[PDB]
Amino acid sequence: ENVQVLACQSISSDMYVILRNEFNTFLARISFTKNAIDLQGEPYRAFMDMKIRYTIPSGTYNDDTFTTSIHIPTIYGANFGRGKITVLEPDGKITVFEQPTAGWNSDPWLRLSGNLEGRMVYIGFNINFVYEFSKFLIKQTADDGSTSTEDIGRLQLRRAWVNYENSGTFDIYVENQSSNWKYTMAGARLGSNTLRAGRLNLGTGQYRFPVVGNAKFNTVYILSDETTPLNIIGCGWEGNYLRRSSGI
Amino acid sequence: LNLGTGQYRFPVVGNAKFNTVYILSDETTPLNIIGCGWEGNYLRRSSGI
Amino acid sequence: IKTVLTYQLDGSNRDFNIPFEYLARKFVVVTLIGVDRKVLTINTDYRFATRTTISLTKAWGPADGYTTIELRRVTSTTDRLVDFTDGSILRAYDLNVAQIQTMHVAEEARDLTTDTIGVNNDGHLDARGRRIVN
Amino acid sequence: NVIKTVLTYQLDGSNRDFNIPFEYLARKFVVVTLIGVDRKVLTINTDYRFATRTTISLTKAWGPADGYTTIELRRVTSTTDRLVDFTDGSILRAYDLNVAQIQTMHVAEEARDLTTDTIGVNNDGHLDARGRRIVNLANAV
Amino acid sequence: KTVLTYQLDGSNRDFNIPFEYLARKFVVVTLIGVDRKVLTINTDYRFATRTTISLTKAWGPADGYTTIELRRVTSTTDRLVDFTDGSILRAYDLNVAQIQTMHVAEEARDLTTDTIGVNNDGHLDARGRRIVNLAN
Amino acid sequence: RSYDMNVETAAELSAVNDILASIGEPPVSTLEGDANADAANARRILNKINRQIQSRGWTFNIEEGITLLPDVYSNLIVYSDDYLSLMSTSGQSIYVNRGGYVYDRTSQSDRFDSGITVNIIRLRDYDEMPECFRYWIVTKASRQFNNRFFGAPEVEGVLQEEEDEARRLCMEYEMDYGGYNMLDGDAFTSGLLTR
Amino acid sequence: SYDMNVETAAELSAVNDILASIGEPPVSTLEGDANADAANARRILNKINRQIQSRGWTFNIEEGITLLPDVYSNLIVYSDDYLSLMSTSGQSIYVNRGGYVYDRTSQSDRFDSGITVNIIRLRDYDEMPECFRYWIVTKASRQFNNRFFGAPEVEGVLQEEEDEARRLCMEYEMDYGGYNMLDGDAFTSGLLTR
Amino acid sequence: SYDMNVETAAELSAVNDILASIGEPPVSTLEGDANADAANARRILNKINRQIQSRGWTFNIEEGITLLPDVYSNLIVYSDDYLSLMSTSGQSIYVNRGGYVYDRTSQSDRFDSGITVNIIRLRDYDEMPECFRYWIVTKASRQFNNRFFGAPEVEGVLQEEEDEARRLCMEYEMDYGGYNMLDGDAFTSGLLTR
Amino acid sequence: LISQSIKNLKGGISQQPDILRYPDQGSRQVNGWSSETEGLQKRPPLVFLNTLGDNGALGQAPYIHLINRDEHEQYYAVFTGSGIRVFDLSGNEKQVRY
Amino acid sequence: LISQSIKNLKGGISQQPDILRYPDQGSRQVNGWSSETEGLQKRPPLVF
């Protein structure tokens, strides 16, 4: 929200970014590594901004409130203005903390539920991915490369599909003028060799979701703030098309 | 300000050759025109070529 | 806290508010106790004006012979709201609804005390009217 | 109210088939008892068989004669041992989640069974002692 | 066994709890007394081990507060598990998700035995009490 | 896996699955929540057709002699939307609804003292219906949800035949169930056969 | 013509079903948000509501009701809610001239003491038998499917539904009216007197 | 509705035949592995199993069986396994209101001592004559071929098979019931007494 | 009944009208990486290396240049506008004498 | 019944005969700015 970005400069396949907060400035790294776990011992690459791996200090746990609390300034060296912070344990456990209303600078502490004192928690903010889709008109390529869309008829749309591969926790929102429906693809299908209790739920497939209405007024966006990855290969749609005036 | 997006369908009736359409605005507000369509009965008797 | 609540019936009040977090809606039942238990149907007599109020159409009262509108929530053990099916994404909304529904059934199980014989001052068991039978 | 997991069907003579409506999760979780002067729980194959998925056929037919006025078929889902329990690497199958969720619902419906046990209201505005003796009970004042 | 009274004579801090609980906030401790009093946790009772609570001071029969009656009140709204989109599922997660409901049900089925209830013989035992307000 | 398991399912939920099987898409797990459109549309077309199949009077539906009763204070009897039909017991029904209250058209009175007796078609749910009809409420909803959304002509043309077979079976259900008699059970020619 | 400036939950489920007819998602309120399709649907529902009532039906035709002239004016308002005024016996004599009932035969717009007329009056969609409430929708489900989304294959199925709905509606009064050939009419009831 | 949470080898060969109907390879177990097609096939088999039993057939219709009310409740559970309750003679009076048998005529859900009803109850696919076991498959082999793999030419052959199967099924009880016109019925058996 | 499929989602935001956009293009794409092999993914996550002091430490508008001279001599140099603060890529300040 | 749509209005005045003009071109365009993203707009205003 408030991160002023100083000039990043890629070195190899790694991009070194400098940010402002505006409490403290930082140097961070983005590396496009397909298959790596960005930090050591992390269960899966967790697409969380500002990942840090923190071994909890001993003094934090208090028996009376049964919580272990870690100060944000201690973990990163800086206080942060806004955002949701996910603390991922070595096991899959994820605890997400929404910003205190004032900010994370008013009250820094992250009150983890159990007694964790020697655990290593990978803590970071959540990256928000948003991809609106262009309206689903009938786009027909001409003999030449340029594509022209038929807007001279009513296309009433009935279904749509998103083909994905190895992705998770994404939400596709279809909004007509007054409707706002949300459809969530949450992972591997039940019974797949992929869905297992302790492993990440990452699945490949086609999710067919219903988009209903005039194409011109329907909007679909895919939004994911989760720690897991995302892939979108293709997108289809079907629907009744009826242009009365048989053109050309 | 009343600024809107849409398609305004208006009736132009008659032989295409003799109909003229002009858009004129002297108002303080902006204007955008993206595309323009038309429909109409077409009947060429002499099936050409 | 609390699934089963009863109101008082006077002739002109028709709107009564529902405290519990009902899942569905078929789950709230509204029975006019009065002298004789009488169950109200979903739209002919009572109607859910807001998520949180049940507004009677007839505005019953003691003049009809009925007092003490009893509107209790009975979660359905058989009509499950989530049925997992092979080949369907395990959405988290499903697991949470399953857990919520079973915990609602148990929460209403905790209210049978309001239901039973009852203990008066002292240990005296009590039966207010309610002749014991069988 | 009403109680949907305890059903007591009258016993007359040779009716040796009674039906189990409640959805029971396993054949050992239904207990058939021949209530009368002395409750007698019946064993799974010596006495009662399960003719169909939803019918129990007693082997002998017991009537009002041997004592045994009524038969109660009720559900006892074991709260202790979970029928399916997940483990770390298990493939999650729509059967496992379903059997798990179905068992907890069954345990809470056993709270209506608890209403059946204590003295509680029946269909009429009558506290029901459901065919059992009020033991102890003090005196009159 | 959600309820069991621990009548102890002196300032005895240790009272073992046999009802396995999900969290500290579920076990509520009251002293049976002329007046029942809900002892708060941090200030009055502390969990020495999960199994054993340990009270500070412990009151007494000499005090008005008498015996101590600890019990399980497992909350029915504050769900311990919130399944979210992965967020790897955890085996510990599903099993606890079902254990909370089993606990609520099991401790709710003891809110009946405190009344008439049923003996092994199959008979509804009033505990030598007098049934008032009955009709013939 | 144990053979010894009798477990049930939502007859309402399994009906919405059968609708979404018909148009061609995977089974939707839970109907809850107004987000999924397909569930809401498939559930509404189920409900909107449930009130038609029932409205056509069938022998079980038509309660006879049901006495509606007036409010003591205002003496007006409410006509709900659950009363699919309200008609007089004998002939020339005199009841109509004016402003949501039963009105006697002949006497022009919205005020009834002491009650009216009528044949009400009550609206009841998919789960109180005979299986014969529970099939047909779905497979008629399986046509209009195929009509209004998945407009492929070849599978509506297949499904039409099915809705018709279902009507035939549903009809057969009451001609047995009502058990109607020409010459021994009616109003007119039962009286003529008296010796 | 009475116009639509009020809303009803039972009427709202009808406009949802007319928007189902194209393949459009349901509206949630008929507020006035720029949903051209919903507006058009409300128009076609009302515009067809005034046919189904116009075709006379037994509960619709109030019979023998008296319209009263305003005393000082001496004329009766013949409003647009009165779909068919008619007359009770034969050769109906009342016609609308201006907005007031006029005796076609006696050339007078002035009446003292009223008229016994058989009037079919507009009733709300909600105030309608369920049999017709379906058919007013599924007839509006045709013309709304013909005027904006003109696909032929989703219409040709719908026309076969409108007709079934009409059959069911017609069946509804032939029970409800209870019309008797030889025991209940005006002519051949009188012939059967012994 | 009873739902499918158990398996049977004789039932497994039916789902193989419904997957043959598209052109899909046979499954080996109905474990729950993500085979959408097999799951859908199990759904259509069960969903059509509850028609073929619903149409009454002679062995299906238990005749004159007594349903016993639970003694304390005084009502009888009318479960979803009872496809058609009916009644033994005429004008069946029992209807399902809530989940319990209700006497439509006497407005009572309370019964003492039971009822003689003619009930068609659900029986497993396996508990079915072989003539029907074919036809439950080859009717499911149509709707599964219409809902997921909508090819018209492999359906139009299948519809000609469903009908043959029905003929063979119908032939099965007209032997099995052994129904007699003039010597076995209720009316014209009594007329032939000398 | 017509259907179309956008084979890939490679194009990004396009502000051209919707009737003119090519099939791949879309209205908004935030925090996404359109690779050729898998069409759209979430950007790779930032990994924290070090904090480089307060907000004003580097100044309102620094000119920052990366000196990639060698594998071991990769340094960043920021010009505060009041001075030079050089940082190793691990975030370690390297003293700049003037 | 035939219909055609001029996708964009990018071309300006053309004095060629109407039977020869391309679809985009038009007879008069005064005080207008034919941008690619939004086809025709009013010129930006003069500021004194």
PDB file of C-alpha atoms in Angstrom, chain C residues 1-59:
ATOM      1  CA  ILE C   1     -26.600 -19.008  23.733  1.00  0.00           C
ATOM      2  CA  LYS C   2     -29.273 -19.697  23.137  1.00  0.00           C
ATOM      3  CA  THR C   3     -30.835 -21.972  20.547  1.00  0.00           C
ATOM      4  CA  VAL C   4     -34.313 -22.326  22.078  1.00  0.00           C
ATOM      5  CA  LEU C   5     -36.084 -19.141  23.143  1.00  0.00           C
ATOM      6  CA  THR C   6     -39.766 -18.446  23.747  1.00  0.00           C
ATOM      7  CA  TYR C   7     -41.562 -15.137  23.477  1.00  0.00           C
ATOM      8  CA  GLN C   8     -44.827 -13.897  24.957  1.00  0.00           C
ATOM      9  CA  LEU C   9     -47.904 -13.581  22.843  1.00  0.00           C
ATOM     10  CA  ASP C  10     -50.290 -10.665  22.982  1.00  0.00           C
ATOM     11  CA  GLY C  11     -52.749 -10.084  20.243  1.00  0.00           C
ATOM     12  CA  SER C  12     -51.063  -7.274  18.353  1.00  0.00           C
ATOM     13  CA  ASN C  13     -47.378  -8.141  18.255  1.00  0.00           C
ATOM     14  CA  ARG C  14     -46.369 -10.006  15.214  1.00  0.00           C
ATOM     15  CA  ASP C  15     -42.626  -9.448  14.946  1.00  0.00           C
ATOM     16  CA  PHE C  16     -40.329 -11.580  17.033  1.00  0.00           C
ATOM     17  CA  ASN C  17     -36.535 -11.665  16.666  1.00  0.00           C
ATOM     18  CA  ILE C  18     -34.302 -14.715  16.327  1.00  0.00           C
ATOM     19  CA  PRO C  19     -31.029 -14.709  18.270  1.00  0.00           C
ATOM     20  CA  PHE C  20     -29.325 -17.890  17.099  1.00  0.00           C
ATOM     21  CA  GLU C  21     -27.054 -18.249  14.132  1.00  0.00           C
ATOM     22  CA  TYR C  22     -29.315 -20.386  12.027  1.00  0.00           C
ATOM     23  CA  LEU C  23     -27.792 -22.133   9.046  1.00  0.00           C
ATOM     24  CA  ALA C  24     -30.405 -22.589   6.321  1.00  0.00           C
ATOM     25  CA  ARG C  25     -33.818 -21.357   7.391  1.00  0.00           C
ATOM     26  CA  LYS C  26     -35.811 -24.489   7.274  1.00  0.00           C
ATOM     27  CA  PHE C  27     -33.931 -24.987  10.458  1.00  0.00           C
ATOM     28  CA  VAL C  28     -35.949 -22.467  12.499  1.00  0.00           C
ATOM     29  CA  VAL C  29     -39.311 -23.854  13.590  1.00  0.00           C
ATOM     30  CA  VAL C  30     -41.923 -21.561  15.133  1.00  0.00           C
ATOM     31  CA  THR C  31     -44.539 -23.348  17.226  1.00  0.00           C
ATOM     32  CA  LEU C  32     -47.289 -21.438  19.014  1.00  0.00           C
ATOM     33  CA  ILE C  33     -47.416 -23.274  22.332  1.00  0.00           C
ATOM     34  CA  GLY C  34     -50.470 -21.706  23.860  1.00  0.00           C
ATOM     35  CA  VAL C  35     -52.673 -24.388  25.315  1.00  0.00           C
ATOM     36  CA  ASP C  36     -51.855 -26.854  22.520  1.00  0.00           C
ATOM     37  CA  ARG C  37     -48.698 -27.172  20.450  1.00  0.00           C
ATOM     38  CA  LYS C  38     -49.283 -25.775  16.967  1.00  0.00           C
ATOM     39  CA  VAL C  39     -46.581 -25.476  14.323  1.00  0.00           C
ATOM     40  CA  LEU C  40     -46.507 -22.555  11.907  1.00  0.00           C
ATOM     41  CA  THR C  41     -45.773 -23.077   8.215  1.00  0.00           C
ATOM     42  CA  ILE C  42     -43.066 -21.313   6.289  1.00  0.00           C
ATOM     43  CA  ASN C  43     -45.136 -18.759   4.399  1.00  0.00           C
ATOM     44  CA  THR C  44     -48.866 -19.156   5.021  1.00  0.00           C
ATOM     45  CA  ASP C  45     -48.736 -17.841   8.588  1.00  0.00           C
ATOM     46  CA  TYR C  46     -45.219 -16.700   9.544  1.00  0.00           C
ATOM     47  CA  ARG C  47     -42.639 -15.149   7.221  1.00  0.00           C
ATOM     48  CA  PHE C  48     -38.964 -14.249   7.651  1.00  0.00           C
ATOM     49  CA  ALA C  49     -38.978 -10.517   7.317  1.00  0.00           C
ATOM     50  CA  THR C  50     -35.297  -9.960   7.912  1.00  0.00           C
ATOM     51  CA  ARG C  51     -32.742 -12.615   8.521  1.00  0.00           C
ATOM     52  CA  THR C  52     -33.323 -11.856  12.151  1.00  0.00           C
ATOM     53  CA  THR C  53     -37.132 -11.533  12.559  1.00  0.00           C
ATOM     54  CA  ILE C  54     -40.070 -13.867  12.001  1.00  0.00           C
ATOM     55  CA  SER C  55     -43.162 -11.874  11.330  1.00  0.00           C
ATOM     56  CA  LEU C  56     -46.472 -13.537  11.775  1.00  0.00           C
ATOM     57  CA  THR C  57     -49.150 -12.652   9.199  1.00  0.00           C
ATOM     58  CA  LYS C  58     -52.152 -13.206  11.472  1.00  0.00           C
ATOM     59  CA  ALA C  59     -50.715 -11.582  14.622  1.00  0.00           C
TER      60      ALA C  59
END
